[PDB]
Design a protein around this ligand. Sequence first.
Ligand SMILES: *[C@H](O)[C@H](C[C@@H]1CCNC1=O)NC(=O)[C@H](CC(C)(C)C)NC(=O)[C@@H](NC(=O)OCc1ccccc1)[C@@H](C)OC(C)(C)C
Ligand SMILES: *[C@H](O)[C@H](C[C@@H]1CCNC1=O)NC(=O)[C@H](CC(C)(C)C)NC(=O)[C@@H](NC(=O)OCc1ccccc1)[C@@H](C)OC(C)(C)C
Lengths: 306, 306
Amino acid sequence: SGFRKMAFPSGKVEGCMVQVTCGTTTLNGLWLDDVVYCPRHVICTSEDMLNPNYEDLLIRKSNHNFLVQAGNVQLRVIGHSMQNCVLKLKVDTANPKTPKYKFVRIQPGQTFSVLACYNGSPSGVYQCAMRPNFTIKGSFLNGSCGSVGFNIDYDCVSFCYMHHMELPTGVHAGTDLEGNFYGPFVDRQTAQAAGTDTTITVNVLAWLYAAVINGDRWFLNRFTTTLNDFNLVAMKYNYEPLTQDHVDILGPLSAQTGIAVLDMCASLKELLQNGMNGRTILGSALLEDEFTPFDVVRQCSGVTFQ
Amino acid sequence: SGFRKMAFPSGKVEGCMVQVTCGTTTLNGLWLDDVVYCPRHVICTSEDMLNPNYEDLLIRKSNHNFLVQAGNVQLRVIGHSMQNCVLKLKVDTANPKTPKYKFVRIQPGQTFSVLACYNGSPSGVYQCAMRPNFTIKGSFLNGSCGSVGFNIDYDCVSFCYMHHMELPTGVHAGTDLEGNFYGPFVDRQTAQAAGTDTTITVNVLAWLYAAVINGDRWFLNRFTTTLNDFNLVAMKYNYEPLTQDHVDILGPLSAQTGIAVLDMCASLKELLQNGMNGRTILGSALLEDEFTPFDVVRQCSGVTFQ
Ligand SMILES: *[C@H](O)[C@H](C[C@@H]1CCNC1=O)NC(=O)[C@H](CC(C)(C)C)NC(=O)[C@@H](NC(=O)OCc1ccccc1)[C@@H](C)OC(C)(C)C
Ligand SMILES: *[C@H](O)[C@H](C[C@@H]1CCNC1=O)NC(=O)[C@H](CC(C)(C)C)NC(=O)[C@@H](NC(=O)OCc1ccccc1)[C@@H](C)OC(C)(C)C
């Protein structure tokens, strides 16, 4: 038993992580087969970052402007081509460590793991989520750009994120691997604000089942509510409305525990209307929304990967 | 900026993780050079687990009783020898992926990362700490035994933990890599209880500096206390006494911020005597003790590894 914020093993992504240097700019890039994906503001300067027209800047460049480096060994670039906000550098060697992989575009609510890098050398791995406001509460310093988020389903790596920029409230933003930003942010230095966040309700309920599975049960009650009446108190507390499709995915968990989904909504209801009054759930003094219903199953029934 | 519970990249440990099967018992084992380290109750049965005399059980065994398996390929055992609570299986091949490594025995307070495995296939990676009561608040299911905790200092892996058993309050216990249990627990199924936990004070203060570095500052104050007078309120709240050696390691952080260590003790003091009254620090409604003063430096000044 026990329940920790857990991350996918990062071995397979470490094998693709390289250093990309251009001008006076060094960031990280992802090397799959014979292609190296990095963010395109690697071609910018400090003065460029104010309102670049990346199509112009890029057309001046030649191949030899791109110092790519895997470990110490220098990759030879032989092509480039900008797709949305990522650059695609065709080099002269395919990555021997290329794993099974795909590119995906996640929805808000879905979670993933992040391997933070600087100069191509991994530094850490955390697990976080795609906020309702298309931001992520991450941990990034200068040079952290080009690091990726990802899920692993047995042998296959689903890349879903690349890092580009920090917003002034300390939150972060970036794109899928096809270059398209999540949310309405642009890779340039002009003011822009995240937009009010909400609480991912379906993930809170998934987490509350994880609390039940692990012996925590003080928050339960006899009460039951109908979803119409839950969603009017959840709004008030600025939670995502709950769809019948949420209740569907929560069924399995509802039956490993014999607690009706509609009863667990009645407990959360009381938790919001009274708070938590000195106690913790799963060692957290807060309701926790960064665990998906399929996250809970993972950790509580022990799925592995290879 | 930003601040997440972060884990070392697990690539190098994944490369050593193998399956060890004996009798009707399957657990995970660690293969470095030509030696495979697993926990010894892999030789037990269900009835044995009540009061085994591992020296007897082991002397009946032959080499061919140990089904070792790295991926699908069957390692050939050619020797064994029990050192404290770990078995050491000499096989006929050295691990091509053996990294630079060492074995260490951590103190309470120090943290490490955990790569949870089942049947040899990694499942997740989390970061946690060696509680003051020689337990760890981990997340483990059946078959999780033989998984390790570890730190990485540039290129070198310091193994400090192997998994053996869960305690009935949901907490966990295990050994260093030389077989010796942390704390007073034994690998057998007879009753034993963790002992009251405390709060690792030096790590709370390290974390509070991380809060300062990242813009959170509502808990600060003009006040200052002398350490004699701090330690009498910290006791009350069942915190570790603070040594002058703590203040020493906290200096660097004290000066990236111009906050005297002795002033930060005066803020924590008020936080315990009043609680936190609706607000969060670093997105946690709690004071967080699983970040070391050298953890904070890592993440807030971006050290990498290879
Ligand atoms: C690339 O590795 C780098 C990583 C960031 C450094 C620290 N954390 C990071 O996420 N990204 C950038 O430096 C990026 C550069 C581009 C804008 C993508 C070209 N810049 C930022 O992240 C800035 N954010 C920003 O300027 O957004 C627009 C804006 C401007 C003014 C007011 C509000 C919003 C960061 C560095 O600026 C702060 C938001 C931290 C002030
Ligand atoms: C090996 O992989 C396995 C992993 C555990 C299964 C789930 N989580 C784990 O940590 N470890 C064991 O099964 C271990 C077997 C030995 C005792 C090491 C031989 N057993 C336990 O962890 C039990 N704990 C236990 O029996 O401790 C002594 C005890 C006995 C009675 C009352 C209190 C303490 C677990 C399985 O038993 C519970 C504590 C969960 C009831």
